[PDB]
Each structure stands twice: as C-alpha cells, then as structure tokens.
C-alpha cells in the first residue's frame, strides 16, 4: 500500500475524469451536431416546399 | 512467473490469446523462414517484412528451378536435333 | 481499494448511458426546434 | 544457355539477400522468443476491466521483490502513461516453490 | 482545460490599479469607480440583482477593454470580465447581454484580440461564444474579423508560453464554433487547417497525444462542414494521419481517427485509395488490435466493411455480371484485361465451362450484333486466356457464336466473332 494504494486511487480518479468524460462529451457533441444538421436539412426541405406553395399562390 | 489462470479458464482466445494466435502465426512464419535459411546457410511489421522476404526468396527459388528445367528441356531438344 | 475501481467502472458506465440519453434527447428537442423555426420563417414569408 | 544464366543470376541475388535475411532472422530468433514469451505471459495474465490494467500474480522472492519497482518504473516511463502500476504482496496459505 | 487554467492564472496574477491609470489621463474616474464597484456587482449577481451586475457592466467592460489597450492593465480588466465572458451560462445575465444580438456580440470584437495569451484565452472564448450563434456573428461582425486578425495564428505560434497553451484553446474554440456551420466552414478555419497539416502527422509526446485528440476533434468538426471537408482534401498528411492512427498507443485516439474516416463517407479518391492501402493492413491490424470500447470496435468493424465495399468500386464484379451473367452483353472487366479474363473464366469453367456454356448459348442466338460483339469479344478473351479452354469454347456454342455474324454487315460483331474463332483455333493446337 502506502504510495501503491494512493497511486492506484489516483489512477482510478484519472480514469473516471479523463476516459469517461472525453468519450462521453465527444459522443454527445457529435450526436447533437449531427441531429441539428439533419433536422435543419429537413426543415430546409420543408421551407423549399413552402416557398413553392407561396410561389403558386 | 504467472500461472495460466485465463488459459485454464479457456484455452480458446483466453483473454489476450488472440494476440497469442497472431504471435503464433508470426512464429510459424519465422520458423519457416529459419528453415529456409538453414537450407541456404545464412548466419542464423517486422514479421510481415520477414514473411514477404521469405515469400520472395521462395518465388525466386521456384523461378530458378523452373528455368533450370526449361534449360534441361532445351538442351534435350538441341541434343536430339543435333543427333538427327 | 478494489471497491474504488468497481465504483469507477460503475460511474463510467453511468456516464456513458447519460451521454447516450443526452444524444437522444438532443435529437428529439432539435426536431421540435427546427419545426418551430420553419413555422416562423413561413410566417415572415407570408408577411 | 540464356535461361540457365538468368536462373543462376537470380539464385546469386537471392543468396546475397538471404545472407542479410538470415542475420535479420538470427536477431529475430531472440525477437520471436521474446514475443512468444510475452504472449504466453499475457495469456497467463488476467485483464481487469474495472482497473483497466491486466492483473499479474506470480511467486517472487520477498527480498528480491524490492527490485521489481525499477522494471515497473522503466516500463511506465517507456509507456509514458500517467497511470502507475502497483505491485503488492499477498499473504496466503499457498506455499510458493 | 490546462491551457485555460494557466492563462487565467497568469492573467489574475498581475494586478493593475485602474485609479492610477485613470489619473494618468488614460482612463476616467467613473471607470475607476465602476471597476471598484464590479465586486459588488458580482456579489449582486450572486444575490440576483441583474441590473447592477451585468446590464451596465457589459458596456462598462467594453469601455474598459477599449480604453485599457495596454496588455498590463488588460490583464486585470480581462480577469475581472472573465466571469461574464467565460460562457453563456457563467454569469448568465451579463453573458446574455453580451451575446443577446449580433450588435452586442460584435461589440466584444473590439475587446477581442487584445493583450497577451493570458487574456487571449478569454478573448478566444468570447469570440467562440459570439461565433457559436451564427446570427450573433455576422461576416462583418465574425469570419472576416477572424481571418484578418492573425492574432489567432500568433497565439498558436506562441511556443515559449507552453506546448499547448494557444493550441488547446484554439482547438476548443474551433470545436465550439463547429456548432455554427458558417464558423466551421469559414476560410479562416480552413486556412489554419493547411497550416496545421504537419501537426497531424506526429504525436510522439504524451502532450502530443492530447494534441492528437485535439486534431481528431478538429477532424470531426471538418467532417461536419462540407467546405471544411474540401479544405481537408486539399490539406495533406491524410496518409500520415492514417499511419499515425495505425501506430496509436491511445485506443481512444485510434477510435477517434476511425470515426473521422467513417464520417468521411464522401469519396475523396486520394484518401479512399490510402484507406484501401490501409484496409489491407491498418484495418486488419485494428481488427487484430481490438481494444477499449466494444462500441468503438463495432464501429471499426462497420468502417472496415464499408471500406471493403468501396474497394474496387469501379473495378467491381458488377460490370461482369451485367455483361456475361445478365445475358445482354456489355462492358465487362474480363474483356478489359487478360488477367481479369482468366479470373472470370475460373468461375465460369466449373463443369465443362457451365457458365461459359451459358454465355455461349446466349451469344449464339443474339439478334443484336452489338451485344453479340461484346459477347464474342469476351469469349475471345476467355479462349486466349487458356489454350485448352479455347478448345472447350470451340466445343461449346462459342464456335457457334463465332460462326453467327462472322462476316455480317456489322464490322464489330464480325471482328469479335473472328477473334473468338481464332483464339479457339490457337488454343486447339500449340
């Protein structure tokens, strides 16, 4: 123990912070951006349809 | 020295026995190359390079043997035609 | 000792699950947000 | 004659390269020995998912165990990871040879 | 992160007396009073009094930044304003006032690009926050401002400060701005991508591993924006990045690189060919060297499957299937190259050239000479591939196909049929 157990606990805490947070935030940000972009494309298609209807009117 | 706890649990793929299988393929390639070198007599990633070199040497030996056989065939034809 | 490592693994799993849930919620919210934005754009076009 | 000359030249070049190939394999003898030993040890070793570090237990001299820290620190510096391996001694009824 | 923490520590370490500078005819006494009452304003922000906390303090901070141009006083001014300028939620009322509109966001641009790296951390954070909302950052407010301000590249080149002091800050700012497609696809960001091409290749240092992760995040941001994708295609070190990912100790970095490659679903012929080289070696090793998240391994397997599908997309069996197998002869890989002809014949001849017999039967009863021409050309290539195979084709309807339209009015069909017959004859006798 002594420095060994302290080093092990520090390694566990470093894992918890770095490994867990990095992948989690990367996935969250990437998925949010992708969903925003895809739904913005869908909204753009809907707006194009609305513009066509307005042109017909 | 550590006991084979994971291997005792399962010899098949154990915990890192997939890496062991890759190393086994590398060792088989190394043994084949060592046997080929012993046939020749030389002083005796990197595994892939050694395997490629051994394959090239085998291909060169096969080509040399085929060319020697072709030379023998042509010598046979020349000798027969000269005798005729 | 090892209990800390087990708690670390559990926390990491919980964080991963939270990230997945946050991704799903972000997509769900983005759908309605873009729908409302398209509605507002249609309204200003009508104006 | 042409085919025999071509075969002889190819064989000579093959042997010239094969000398260096054999020297490389001679080094690769020790290299493959080390690789096979490492693979066998890893198969013997058990990975710990929670700690993310593979667990290795063996019978070691209690006195000589003080010197393993040097190799551990050397490996850690070579790996350069902030993660630090821990070696501990366990008392048990099992009698090590 | 560490870079932002170091910059904030350096900024807050130096204290600047605003009263002395104001008395020195550089600032106003009212400015000194506002700076002294900024502590009470922050306390009221903690006490939920938004009016004194952030409302006038936004204009007060803008005026303080404009007046204190010197980096020495700018350090303390930015340290005080960092609470509002850090993020939209941090000191929300003041942050909401700062980022409420395009004009309000453009107001911080004058404050931005001021002082050294310590204050430049907060400056880049505020620039990203304004740029995060596309409306808050108009092109004149802030893509043009960012492109014309080479202070970003200067903070990136501030090597003596730390290894990643401007680099981590710049990477984080770029990742934040990737939310706005305009900020991500701005030529200012694209210009730095080419400048950072050498940084993509080596990640030997442990700090460089974090730099490699930042580069991977930038790669993901580029994958978000199509113009950024075009710039990356122009940018080099893509095969170097592939090699680095192959030699990746950090499995997270390798997973990020694989994810970026998968996000590069667009063709990008150069990177596609490099991955095809990688797929035989790099993808195979990654499959062998599976590690870290099982989800990452599954994504790597999916990327490998996609790469295998894309491999030989032009030189696929689709042309051969449409030509020989379909029965309406067309462009086939077999006719293109004799090696491909032998490869196709290998599958064709199983039992007395069963597939080749079917093709010959289709070609024999062909009203259209053009399809007959293509079929006869394929038969000629197959016959020339194997001498015994040529005799087998002559035994089959390939001789019948050659006889059909052998010297017809069409020239292509006649030539192809004659070539098939000649190949059969050449294979009949050696």
From Swiss-Prot, chain A:
Subunit of the peripheral V1 complex of vacuolar ATPase essential for assembly or catalytic function. V-ATPase is responsible for acidifying a variety of intracellular compartments in eukaryotic cells. The keyword Repressor does not apply. It comes from Citrus unshiu (Satsuma mandarin). V-ATPase is a heteromultimeric enzyme composed of a peripheral catalytic V1 complex (components A to H) attached to an integral membrane V0 proton pore complex (components: a, c, c', c'' and d). Belongs to the V-ATPase E subunit family. The chain holds residues 2 to 58 of 230 of the full protein. GO terms for molecular function: proton-transporting ATPase activity, rotational mechanism. One of its GO terms (cellular component) is proton-transporting two-sector ATPase complex, catalytic domain. Keywords: Hydrogen ion transport, Ion transport, Transport. This is V-type proton ATPase subunit E. It comes from the Eukaryota. The lineage of its organism: Eukaryota, Viridiplantae, Streptophyta, Embryophyta, Tracheophyta.
């Amino acid at each position: 123990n002594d420095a060994d157990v302290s080093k092990q606990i520090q390694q566990m805490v470093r894992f918890i912070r770095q490994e867990a947070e990095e992948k989690a935030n990367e996935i969250s940000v990437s998925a949010e951006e992708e969903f925003n972009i895809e739904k913005l494309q869908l909204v753009e298609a809907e707006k194009k349809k609305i513009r066509q209807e307005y042109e017909r009117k | 020295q550590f006991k084979d706890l994971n291997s005792e649990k399962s010899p098949f793929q154990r915990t890192y026995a997939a890496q062991i299988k890759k190393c086994a393929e590398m060792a088989r390639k190394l043994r084949f190359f060592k046997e080929q070198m012993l046939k020749a007599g030389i002083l005796s990633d990197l595994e892939v390079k050694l395997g490629d070199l051994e394959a090239e040497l085998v291909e060169i030996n096969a080509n040399g043997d085929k060319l020697q056989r072709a030379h023998s065939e042509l010598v046979e034809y020349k000798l027969v035609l000269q005798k005729a | 000792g090892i209990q800390q490592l087990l708690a670390a693994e559990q926390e990491a799993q919980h964080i991963v699950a939270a990230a997945r849930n946050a991704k799903m919620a972000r997509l769900r919210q983005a759908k309605e947000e873009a729908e409302r934005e398209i509605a507002e754009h249609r309204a200003q076009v009508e104006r | 004659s042409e085919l025999k000359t071509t075969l002889d030249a190819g064989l000579l070049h093959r042997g010239n390269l094969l000398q260096t190939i054999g020297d490389q394999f001679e080094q690769w003898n020790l290299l493959v020995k080390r690789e096979k030993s490492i693979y066998h040890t890893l198969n013997m070793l058990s990975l710990d998912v929670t700690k993310k570090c593979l667990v290795g237990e063996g019978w070691s001299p209690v006195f000589a165990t003080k010197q393993i820290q040097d190799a551990l620190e050397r490996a850690a510096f070579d790996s350069n990871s902030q993660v630090g391996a821990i070696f501990q001694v366990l008392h048990t009824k099992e009698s090590p040879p | 992160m560490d870079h932002a923490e170091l910059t904030t520590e350096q900024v807050l370490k130096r204290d600047i007396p605003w009263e002395t500078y104001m008395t020195t005819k550089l600032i106003s006494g009212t400015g000194l009073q506002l700076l002294r009452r900024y502590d009470n304003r922050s306390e009221s922000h903690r006490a939920q009094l938004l009016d004194d906390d952030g409302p006038s303090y936004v204009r007060v901070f803008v005026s303080i930044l404009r007046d204190i141009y010197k980096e020495e006083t700018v350090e303390y001014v930015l340290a005080l304003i960092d609470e509002m300028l850090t993020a939209n939620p941090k000191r929300a009322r003041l942050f909401h006032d700062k980022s409420l509109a395009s004009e309000d966001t453009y107001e911080p641009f004058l404050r931005l690009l001021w002082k050294g790296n310590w204050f430049i951390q907060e400056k880049s954070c505020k620039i990203l926050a304004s740029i995060v909302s596309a409306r808050p950052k108009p092109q004149d407010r802030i893509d043009d401002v960012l492109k014309l301000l080479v202070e970003w590249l200067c903070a990136q080149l501030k090597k003596p400060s730390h290894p990643s002091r401007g680099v981590p800050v710049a990477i984080n700012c770029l990742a934040a701005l990737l939310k706005e497609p305009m900020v991500r696809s701005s030529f200012v960001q694209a210009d730095g991508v080419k400048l950072l091409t050498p940084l993509i290749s080596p990640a030997s240092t442990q700090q460089s591993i974090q730099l490699l992760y930042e580069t991977c995040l930038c790669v993901w941001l580029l994958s978000y924006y199509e113009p950024a994708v075009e710039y990356l295609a122009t940018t080099r070190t893509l095969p170097r990045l592939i090699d680095v990912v192959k030699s990746s100790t950090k499995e997270k970095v390798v997973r990020v690189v694989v994810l970026i490659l998968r996000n590069l679903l667009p063709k990008g012929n150069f990177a596609a060919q490099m991955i095809d080289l990688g797929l035989p070696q790099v993808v195979q090793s990654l499959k062998a060297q599976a590690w870290s998240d099982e989800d990452l391994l599954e994504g790597l397997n999916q990327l490998e499957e996609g790469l295998k599908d894309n491999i030989k997309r032009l030189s696929s069996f689709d042309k051969y299937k449409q030509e020989v197998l379909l029965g309406h002869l067309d462009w086939s890989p077999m006719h293109k190259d004799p090696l491909f002809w032998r490869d196709n014949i290998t599958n064709f001849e199983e039992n007395d050239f069963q597939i080749l017999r079917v093709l010959l039967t289709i070609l024999d009863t062909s009203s259209d000479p053009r399809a007959l021409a293509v079929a006869c050309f394929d038969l000629s290539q197959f016959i020339q591939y194997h001498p015994a195979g040529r005799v087998i084709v002559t035994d089959l309807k390939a001789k019948e196909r050659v006889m059909k339209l052998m010297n017809h009015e069409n020239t292509e069909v006649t030539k192809s049929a004659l070539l098939c017959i000649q190949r059969l004859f050449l294979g009949a006798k050696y």
